[PDB]
Coordinates of C-alpha atoms (C1' of nucleotides) and ligand atoms in Angstrom, one line a residue:
Chain A
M1 CA 0.0 0.0 0.0
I2 CA 1.5 3.3 -1.1
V3 CA -0.9 6.2 -0.7
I4 CA -0.2 9.7 -1.9
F5 CA -2.6 12.3 -0.3
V6 CA -2.9 15.6 -2.1
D7 CA -4.4 18.7 -0.5
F8 CA -4.6 22.1 -2.3
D9 CA -3.0 24.9 -0.3
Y10 CA -5.5 27.6 0.8
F11 CA -7.4 26.7 -2.3
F12 CA -10.1 29.4 -2.8
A13 CA -7.7 32.2 -1.9
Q14 CA -5.0 30.6 -4.1
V15 CA -7.3 30.4 -7.1
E16 CA -8.1 34.1 -6.6
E17 CA -4.4 34.8 -6.5
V18 CA -3.9 33.0 -9.9
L19 CA -6.7 34.9 -11.6
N20 CA -5.5 38.2 -10.2
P21 CA -1.7 38.0 -9.5
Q22 CA -1.9 41.5 -7.9
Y23 CA -3.1 39.7 -4.8
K24 CA 0.0 37.6 -4.5
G25 CA 2.0 38.6 -1.4
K26 CA -0.9 40.8 -0.1
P27 CA -3.3 39.6 2.6
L28 CA -6.4 38.2 0.8
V29 CA -9.7 37.0 2.2
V30 CA -12.5 35.0 0.4
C31 CA -15.8 35.7 2.0
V32 CA -19.0 33.5 2.2
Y33 CA -22.3 35.2 3.0
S34 CA -25.8 33.9 3.9
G35 CA -29.2 35.2 2.7
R36 CA -31.1 33.7 5.7
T37 CA -32.7 35.9 8.5
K38 CA -29.4 37.8 8.9
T39 CA -27.2 38.8 5.9
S40 CA -23.8 38.8 7.6
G41 CA -20.7 37.1 6.2
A42 CA -17.7 35.0 7.4
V43 CA -14.2 34.0 6.3
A44 CA -14.2 31.1 3.8
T45 CA -10.4 31.1 3.0
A46 CA -7.6 33.5 3.8
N47 CA -4.2 33.4 2.1
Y48 CA -1.1 33.0 4.2
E49 CA -0.4 36.7 4.6
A50 CA -4.0 37.0 6.0
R51 CA -3.5 33.8 8.1
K52 CA -0.3 35.4 9.5
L53 CA -2.3 38.4 10.7
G54 CA -4.5 36.0 12.6
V55 CA -7.4 35.5 10.1
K56 CA -8.9 32.0 10.2
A57 CA -11.7 30.3 8.4
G58 CA -15.2 30.7 9.9
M59 CA -14.1 33.9 11.6
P60 CA -16.9 36.5 11.3
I61 CA -15.9 39.0 8.6
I62 CA -16.4 41.9 11.0
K63 CA -13.8 40.3 13.3
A64 CA -11.3 39.6 10.5
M65 CA -11.3 43.3 9.5
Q66 CA -10.4 44.2 13.2
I67 CA -7.1 42.3 12.8
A68 CA -6.6 42.6 9.1
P69 CA -7.6 46.1 8.1
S70 CA -5.1 45.9 5.3
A71 CA -6.6 42.8 3.6
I72 CA -8.6 42.6 0.4
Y73 CA -12.0 41.1 0.9
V74 CA -13.5 39.3 -2.1
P75 CA -16.8 37.3 -2.6
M76 CA -16.6 33.5 -3.1
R77 CA -16.9 32.2 -6.6
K78 CA -17.5 28.4 -6.3
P79 CA -17.9 27.7 -10.0
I80 CA -14.4 28.8 -10.7
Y81 CA -12.8 26.9 -7.8
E82 CA -14.8 23.9 -9.0
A83 CA -13.5 24.2 -12.5
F84 CA -9.9 24.4 -11.1
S85 CA -10.6 21.4 -8.9
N86 CA -12.0 19.4 -11.8
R87 CA -8.9 20.1 -13.9
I88 CA -6.4 19.2 -11.3
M89 CA -8.3 16.1 -10.3
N90 CA -8.0 14.9 -13.9
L91 CA -4.2 15.5 -13.8
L92 CA -3.9 13.2 -10.8
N93 CA -6.2 10.6 -12.5
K94 CA -3.4 9.5 -14.8
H95 CA -0.9 9.0 -11.9
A96 CA -2.9 6.5 -9.8
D97 CA -4.0 2.9 -9.9
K98 CA -7.0 4.0 -7.9
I99 CA -8.2 7.5 -6.9
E100 CA -10.6 8.7 -4.2
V101 CA -11.8 12.3 -4.3
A102 CA -12.5 13.4 -0.8
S103 CA -13.4 17.0 -1.4
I104 CA -13.0 19.9 -3.8
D105 CA -9.3 20.1 -2.7
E106 CA -8.4 16.7 -1.3
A107 CA -7.6 13.4 -3.1
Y108 CA -6.1 10.1 -2.1
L109 CA -4.1 8.1 -4.6
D110 CA -3.2 4.4 -4.5
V111 CA 0.1 4.3 -6.5
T112 CA 1.3 0.8 -5.4
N113 CA 1.2 -0.8 -8.8
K114 CA 2.4 2.4 -10.5
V115 CA 5.7 2.5 -8.5
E116 CA 5.9 -1.3 -8.5
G117 CA 5.7 -1.5 -4.6
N118 CA 8.9 0.6 -4.3
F119 CA 8.3 3.3 -1.7
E120 CA 11.1 5.5 -2.9
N121 CA 9.7 5.8 -6.4
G122 CA 6.5 6.7 -4.7
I123 CA 8.1 9.8 -3.2
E124 CA 9.6 10.6 -6.6
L125 CA 6.1 10.4 -8.0
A126 CA 4.7 12.8 -5.4
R127 CA 7.4 15.3 -6.4
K128 CA 6.4 14.9 -10.0
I129 CA 2.7 15.4 -9.2
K130 CA 3.6 18.6 -7.1
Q131 CA 5.7 19.9 -9.9
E132 CA 3.1 19.2 -12.6
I133 CA 0.2 20.8 -10.8
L134 CA 2.3 23.9 -10.3
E135 CA 3.5 24.1 -13.9
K136 CA 0.0 23.3 -15.4
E137 CA -2.3 25.2 -13.0
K138 CA 0.1 27.4 -11.1
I139 CA -1.4 26.0 -7.9
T140 CA 0.9 24.7 -5.0
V141 CA -0.3 21.7 -3.1
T142 CA 0.7 19.8 0.0
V143 CA 1.2 16.1 -0.3
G144 CA 1.6 13.1 2.1
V145 CA 3.1 9.8 1.3
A146 CA 2.4 6.8 3.5
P147 CA 1.3 3.1 3.6
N148 CA -2.3 3.9 4.5
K149 CA -4.8 6.7 3.9
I150 CA -5.1 8.1 7.4
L151 CA -1.3 8.4 7.9
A152 CA -0.9 10.0 4.4
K153 CA -3.4 12.7 5.4
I154 CA -2.0 13.1 8.9
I155 CA 1.5 13.8 7.6
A156 CA 0.4 16.1 4.8
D157 CA -1.4 18.1 7.5
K158 CA 1.9 18.5 9.4
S159 CA 3.6 19.6 6.2
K160 CA 1.4 22.5 5.0
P161 CA 1.8 24.7 3.0
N162 CA 3.6 23.5 -0.2
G163 CA 5.1 20.6 1.7
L164 CA 5.8 16.9 1.1
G165 CA 5.3 14.7 4.2
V166 CA 6.6 11.2 4.2
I167 CA 6.1 8.2 6.5
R168 CA 8.0 5.1 5.5
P169 CA 7.0 1.5 6.4
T170 CA 9.7 1.5 9.2
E171 CA 8.7 4.8 10.7
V172 CA 5.0 3.9 11.2
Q173 CA 5.2 2.3 14.7
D174 CA 7.2 5.2 16.2
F175 CA 4.9 7.7 14.5
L176 CA 1.8 6.2 16.1
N177 CA 3.6 6.2 19.5
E178 CA 4.5 9.8 18.9
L179 CA 1.1 11.0 17.9
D180 CA -1.0 13.4 20.0
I181 CA -4.6 12.3 20.5
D182 CA -6.2 15.5 19.0
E183 CA -4.0 15.3 15.9
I184 CA -6.0 12.2 14.7
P185 CA -8.8 12.6 12.1
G186 CA -12.3 12.1 13.5
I187 CA -11.3 13.6 16.9
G188 CA -12.5 17.3 17.0
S189 CA -11.8 19.5 20.0
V190 CA -14.8 18.3 22.1
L191 CA -13.7 14.6 22.0
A192 CA -10.1 15.6 22.9
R193 CA -11.2 17.6 25.9
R194 CA -13.0 14.5 27.2
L195 CA -10.1 12.2 26.4
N196 CA -7.5 14.3 28.1
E197 CA -9.7 14.5 31.2
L198 CA -9.5 10.7 31.3
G199 CA -5.7 10.3 31.1
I200 CA -5.4 9.8 27.3
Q201 CA -3.1 12.4 25.6
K202 CA -1.3 10.2 23.1
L203 CA -2.5 7.5 20.7
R204 CA -0.6 4.8 22.6
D205 CA -2.5 5.7 25.8
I206 CA -5.4 3.8 24.4
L207 CA -3.8 0.4 24.7
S208 CA -3.8 0.5 28.6
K209 CA -7.5 1.4 28.9
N210 CA -10.3 -1.2 28.5
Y211 CA -12.4 -1.0 25.4
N212 CA -15.6 -0.4 27.5
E213 CA -14.1 2.5 29.5
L214 CA -13.3 4.0 26.1
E215 CA -16.6 3.4 24.3
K216 CA -18.5 5.3 27.0
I217 CA -16.9 8.6 25.8
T218 CA -16.0 7.6 22.2
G219 CA -19.1 5.9 20.8
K220 CA -18.6 2.6 19.0
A221 CA -17.1 3.0 15.6
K222 CA -14.4 5.5 16.7
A223 CA -13.2 3.3 19.6
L224 CA -12.8 0.3 17.1
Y225 CA -11.1 2.6 14.6
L226 CA -8.7 4.1 17.2
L227 CA -7.8 0.6 18.5
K228 CA -6.8 -0.7 15.0
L229 CA -4.9 2.5 14.2
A230 CA -2.8 2.4 17.4
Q231 CA -2.0 -1.2 16.8
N232 CA -1.1 -0.4 13.2
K233 CA -4.0 -2.6 12.0
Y234 CA -5.8 0.1 10.0
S235 CA -5.7 -0.3 6.2
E236 CA -9.0 0.8 4.5
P237 CA -8.3 0.8 0.8
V238 CA -8.5 3.7 -1.7
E239 CA -11.7 3.5 -3.7
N240 CA -12.7 4.8 -7.0
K241 CA -15.4 7.1 -5.6
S242 CA -16.0 10.9 -5.3
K243 CA -17.3 12.1 -2.0
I244 CA -18.4 15.5 -3.6
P245 CA -22.2 15.7 -3.8
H246 CA -24.0 17.3 -6.7
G247 CA -27.5 18.8 -6.3
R248 CA -30.0 21.1 -7.9
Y249 CA -32.8 23.0 -6.1
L250 CA -35.8 24.5 -7.8
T251 CA -38.5 27.0 -6.5
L252 CA -42.1 26.3 -7.4
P253 CA -44.3 29.1 -9.0
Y254 CA -46.5 28.8 -5.8
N255 CA -46.9 26.5 -2.8
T256 CA -48.4 23.0 -3.6
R257 CA -49.1 19.4 -2.4
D258 CA -49.8 18.2 -6.0
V259 CA -47.3 15.7 -7.4
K260 CA -48.4 16.3 -11.1
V261 CA -47.2 19.9 -10.6
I262 CA -44.1 19.2 -8.5
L263 CA -42.8 16.3 -10.7
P264 CA -42.0 18.4 -13.8
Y265 CA -39.8 20.5 -11.5
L266 CA -38.3 17.5 -9.7
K267 CA -37.5 15.8 -13.1
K268 CA -35.7 19.0 -14.1
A269 CA -33.6 19.1 -10.9
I270 CA -32.6 15.5 -11.5
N271 CA -31.6 16.2 -15.0
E272 CA -29.4 19.2 -14.0
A273 CA -27.8 17.2 -11.2
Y274 CA -27.0 14.2 -13.4
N275 CA -25.3 16.5 -15.9
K276 CA -23.0 17.8 -13.0
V277 CA -22.0 14.2 -12.2
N278 CA -19.2 12.2 -13.8
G279 CA -20.0 8.7 -12.6
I280 CA -22.9 6.7 -11.2
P281 CA -24.3 7.9 -7.8
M282 CA -25.2 5.3 -5.1
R283 CA -27.6 7.6 -3.3
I284 CA -30.4 9.9 -4.3
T285 CA -31.9 12.3 -1.8
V286 CA -35.1 14.3 -2.4
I287 CA -35.1 17.5 -0.4
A288 CA -38.3 19.6 0.0
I289 CA -38.7 23.0 1.6
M290 CA -42.2 23.6 2.9
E291 CA -44.2 26.9 3.2
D292 CA -42.8 27.6 6.7
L293 CA -39.3 27.2 5.1
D294 CA -38.3 24.2 7.2
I295 CA -36.6 21.2 5.5
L296 CA -37.9 17.7 4.7
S297 CA -35.6 15.1 3.1
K298 CA -35.2 11.4 2.5
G299 CA -32.9 9.2 0.4
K300 CA -32.2 5.7 -0.9
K301 CA -28.9 3.9 -1.2
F302 CA -28.1 1.6 -4.1
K303 CA -25.3 -0.9 -3.8
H304 CA -24.8 -0.9 -7.6
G305 CA -25.8 2.8 -8.3
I306 CA -28.8 4.6 -10.0
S307 CA -28.8 5.7 -13.6
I308 CA -30.6 8.9 -14.8
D309 CA -33.7 7.1 -16.2
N310 CA -34.2 5.0 -13.1
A311 CA -33.9 8.0 -10.8
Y312 CA -37.2 9.6 -11.9
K313 CA -39.2 6.7 -10.5
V314 CA -37.3 6.6 -7.2
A315 CA -37.3 10.3 -6.7
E316 CA -41.1 10.3 -7.4
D317 CA -41.6 7.7 -4.6
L318 CA -39.4 9.5 -2.1
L319 CA -41.6 12.6 -2.8
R320 CA -44.8 10.7 -2.1
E321 CA -43.2 9.3 1.0
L322 CA -42.4 12.8 2.2
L323 CA -46.0 13.8 1.4
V324 CA -47.3 10.9 3.5
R325 CA -45.0 11.9 6.4
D326 CA -46.2 15.5 6.2
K327 CA -49.9 15.6 5.4
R328 CA -51.8 19.0 5.0
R329 CA -48.7 21.2 4.4
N330 CA -47.6 22.7 1.0
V331 CA -44.1 22.6 -0.5
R332 CA -42.3 25.7 -1.9
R333 CA -38.9 24.6 -3.3
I334 CA -37.7 21.1 -4.3
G335 CA -34.3 19.7 -4.8
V336 CA -32.3 16.5 -5.4
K337 CA -28.9 15.4 -4.1
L338 CA -26.6 12.8 -5.7
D339 CA -23.7 11.4 -3.8
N340 CA -21.4 8.3 -3.3
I341 CA -20.4 8.6 -7.0
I342 CA -18.5 5.6 -8.5
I343 CA -15.8 6.8 -10.8
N344 CA -14.2 5.2 -14.0
Chain B
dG1 C1' -38.3 3.0 10.5
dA2 C1' -37.5 7.6 11.8
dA3 C1' -37.0 12.2 14.6
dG4 C1' -33.9 14.7 17.2
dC5 C1' -29.6 15.6 19.5
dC6 C1' -24.7 16.0 19.1
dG7 C1' -19.8 16.3 17.5
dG8 C1' -17.3 17.1 13.5
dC9 C1' -16.2 19.0 9.1
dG10 C1' -15.5 22.1 4.9
Chain C
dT1 C1' -15.6 30.3 18.3
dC2 C1' -19.2 30.6 13.1
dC3 C1' -22.9 28.7 9.5
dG4 C1' -24.9 24.8 6.6
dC5 C1' -31.6 23.6 0.8
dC6 C1' -25.0 20.6 6.6
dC7 C1' -24.3 15.2 7.4
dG8 C1' -23.6 10.7 9.8
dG9 C1' -23.5 8.2 14.2
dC10 C1' -26.0 7.1 17.9
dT11 C1' -29.6 7.1 21.1
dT12 C1' -34.5 6.6 21.6
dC13 C1' -39.4 5.9 20.9
Ligands
LIG401 N1 -17.9 28.3 8.0 C1 -16.8 27.6 7.9 N2 -16.4 27.2 6.7 C2 -15.3 26.5 6.6 C3 -14.4 26.2 7.7 N3 -13.4 25.5 7.3 C4 -13.5 25.4 5.9 N4 -14.7 26.0 5.5 C5 -15.2 26.0 4.1 C6 -14.8 27.3 3.4 C7 -13.6 27.0 2.6 C8 -13.7 25.4 2.4 C9 -12.3 24.8 2.4 O1 -11.6 24.8 3.7 P1 -10.4 23.7 3.9 O2 -9.8 23.9 5.3 O3 -11.0 22.4 3.5 O4 -9.2 24.0 2.8 P2 -8.2 25.3 2.6 O5 -9.1 26.5 2.5 O6 -7.4 25.0 1.3 O7 -7.2 25.4 3.8 P3 -6.3 24.1 4.3 O8 -5.3 23.9 3.1 O9 -5.6 24.7 5.5 O10 -7.3 23.0 4.7 O11 -14.6 25.0 3.4 C10 -14.9 26.7 9.0 O12 -14.2 26.5 10.1 N5 -16.0 27.4 9.1
LIG402 CA1 -6.6 22.7 1.5

DNA sequence: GAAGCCGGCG
DNA sequence: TCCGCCCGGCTTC
């Protein structure tokens, strides 16, 4: 198992820098707004000059200006960032036996057969990938090379920005021993707080505690996952799937409960969603906003995926099922979501 | 099966 | 130390 994890450096801001080179070297902030009850905005991405002045993602925009008065504040343009992401993902495509797209800026590559099981050529490949993405798209990325997915990510994370993390087969055991508990994917701040207040600060501190004492705080799946990881037993493979969802939402001319009216609009959302997709989804979800604006949704999974034609029937049903769950209340806006896409 | 609560993520 | 046509795990009825 040779995994190369690729993560695009401050992606949205970096794209803005490429389109307008005048921002390069100046503090830049990409802003995301909301048209809900309040119209206020927040930080989506800050470049490193902004991050250096203390600007972080999710920071309310008002606050970011307090600490970065000198920064340039721009609106978010998803479609462009998506186009970039699309292009770069394709470049990676031809460098991997198997490729898993995790998000708009994160991919995992299995390169084991590519580099003939030789870990050194694997590192050489990562360097090539870095170099190519920079030359083709003028985007700098951070990569992580490791025997499994989770390590490959965890080391890239320690190597940002424009870095190249490497954990070799022989370094693994020590690395697990070395690892702080909160540094591990799946453990947010809240879980860490609770784990530290029970004597666990490092990954190897799990071994001494009994599985039941752990579960109580952890859950079920995480406990198991932690156990295997600490013992270096984790090795979930890289799959040919994209974790990025694609959806279309359409407003109705007026509020209704009538399927014959809603369907033509659902059918259109489905069409537009399937055009955005480059594979076969394994889940369809019908989302419906009611008069009082609250959300009602429901999906179905398909082991072997759903094709465009067969989605009309299923989506229709899901809609009826939503209308049987909420009787005597009209819809306003419908949408469909497609995820768990199988690639290639 | 499914509503709702909670931690985590992008 | 913030929001999501959020999203999955888990607990509960
Ligand atoms: N509201 C909010 N949005 C966030 C937050 N973190 C990320 N986002 C959204 C906006 C940008 C997008 C990508 O963020 P990422 O951290 O995945 O990636 P990045 O911007 O390249 O930075 P990095 O390389 O450090 O991960 O997801 C957050 O804490 N709050
Ligand atoms: Ca990134």
